[PDB]
Design a protein around this ligand. Sequence first.
Ligand SMILES: N#C/C(=C\c1cc(O)c(O)c([N+](=O)[O-])c1)C(=O)N1CCCOC1
Ligand SMILES: [Zn+2]
Length: 421
Amino acid sequence: RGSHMTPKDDEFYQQWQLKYPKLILREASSVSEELHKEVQEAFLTLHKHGCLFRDLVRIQGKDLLTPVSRILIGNPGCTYKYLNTRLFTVPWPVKEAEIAAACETFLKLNDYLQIETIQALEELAADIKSRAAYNVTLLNFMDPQKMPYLKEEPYFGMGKMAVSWHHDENLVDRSAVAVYSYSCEGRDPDIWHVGFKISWDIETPGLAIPLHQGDCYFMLDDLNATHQHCVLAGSQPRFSSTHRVAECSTGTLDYILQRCQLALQNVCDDVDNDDVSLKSFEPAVLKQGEEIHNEVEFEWLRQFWFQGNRYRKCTDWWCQPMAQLEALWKKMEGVTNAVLHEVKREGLPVEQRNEILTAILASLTARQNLRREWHARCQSRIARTLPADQKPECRPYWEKDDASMPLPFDLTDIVSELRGQ
Ligand SMILES: N#C/C(=C\c1cc(O)c(O)c([N+](=O)[O-])c1)C(=O)N1CCCOC1
Ligand SMILES: [Zn+2]
């Protein structure tokens, strides 16, 4: 067989206490009814404006649309990488307008939980501030019964799930997660539950916590790593706000901006034109530049633009920044070209001084592979199905013709010829 526990079982309560003490629950009772109304209104305003999109993930080789539609709200400049997609924050007021009100709400929500979390983390150890320093929240929506047949929980016969077993990933080590469940209206199939199991462990029965409108749970400390969770579906739909501490070293605007400036230190920077000349060709510096070229291209631009007309429906925040990274990136094409022009140069011990080859070739093949991968996903069959406001753009894109660009989108030729050298 395969078993699980609910409050309907007696074992449940001691199971919770002895094998899940880091999982905390605070029921709707324990939360301001002022706040309850406000965040439930905020979900609705957001939903009504169509801010919550399914994501076209590319998990484990295959393109998939997520049943759950979502939006990330949080710090200005912050990102959160979830199944190879990098979601960008619609921002909240850390120190069109209905939307800005909801973002506010969720900050308030954020700050409240942050308190609750600090509290419980103290009561627990009985470090902290940072591990509850929630920088973002990922909101979710699912149903009404729009899934024609839904997946069965395979191990404990918990029935139908919205989200299969996983870990919430790309978070600060030993960091917490807080979750406000808004249901609107064995385990009761009509009610939404969060499910829990110990990782690897399929025969300790799992736990299935009913979630009613306004209930809140908390994954403290290493719980999220030691255990897996899933979401079991109800009969009605549900919203949730899941506040996290994303590890955003390498995942903020200011970070990526600096990286660009670091790369453009190797260019003579008197004037913005197409005579791109460089201060050195010590391969190490050229490594670094071409890596950064990749980093901004694929981790920010292609990834941003795959989400298409999505953010502009929520906010214009990223427009200037994303235009600027494009300009920054365009110049980095300039440098690639320049680096090419210097290898195929009459002088230069074209022997020995082809370490400017083993410094860059990886970076450039990777540029080619990834470029195919992102082109593919943008005009694959599933990407057409998507709405005209949503469908992925493959940006930045230019034809072998297009003059302004000093290099081709590639296909390969270059990289072939550089193998040959
Ligand atoms: N679980 C989750 C949720 C997101 C999520 C985050 C990840 O890092 C991740 O890897 C996956 N994932 O692999 O399906 C999902 C979620 O939004 N929830 C589940 C609980 C209550 O509220 C909604
Ligand atoms: Zn999760």
